[PDB]
Amino acid sequence: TMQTARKSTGGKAPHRYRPGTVALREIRRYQKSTELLIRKLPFQ
DNA sequence: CGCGTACGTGCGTTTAAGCGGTGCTAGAGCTGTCTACGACCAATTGAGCGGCCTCGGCACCGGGATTCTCCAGGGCGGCCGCGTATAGGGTCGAT
């Protein structure tokens, strides 16, 4: 502190997934199952 | 690589798919009789196939007509450039 000439410089320191993720996971879900996808009564 | 948008994703609203329970009868399926139609055999006959020939419909082509295919050149505008002129500055002479 008594430094008057050339002081010491040192000494101072909702969630939403990205598009395409759910689609691929849905693809995996339907590729594993074999249940019919179109509903029975509207098809009939 | 950049722009623009269409479809993925999430949520609240809304529709009907699914379950299943119940009742009805139409139509599949079974059965029983009776026969009209098809297989099978024999004898006769011409319709269909190999062969043989002749002939013209089309393969081949040279000339002529045409129907595209490509480009090539002339004009016109712009940009650069060599030459001449004109103004400005510097130097020399005179008062």
Method: X-ray
DSSP A1-15: ----SS---SS----
* Tokens describing residue A1: 């502190």
Q: How many angstroms separate the CA of A30 from the C1' of B42?
A: 72
Closest C1' nucleotide to A42's CA:
B17
Determine the Cα–Cα distance for residues A22 and A8; give it in Å rounded to an integer. 62
* Distance, Å, A36 CA → B22 C1': 28
Position A44: which residue type? Q
Tokens of A42: 């509207």
Residue A32 near residue A25, CB atoms below 8 Å: no
Tokens representing A3 are 């430094």
Residues in CB range of A37: below 8 A, 6 or more apart: A30
Q: Is residue A30 within 8 Å of residue A37, measured between CB atoms?
A: yes
Q: Which pair of tokens denotes residue A37?
A: 């996808």
For chain A, what is the total number of helices (H) and then of strands (E)?
2, 0
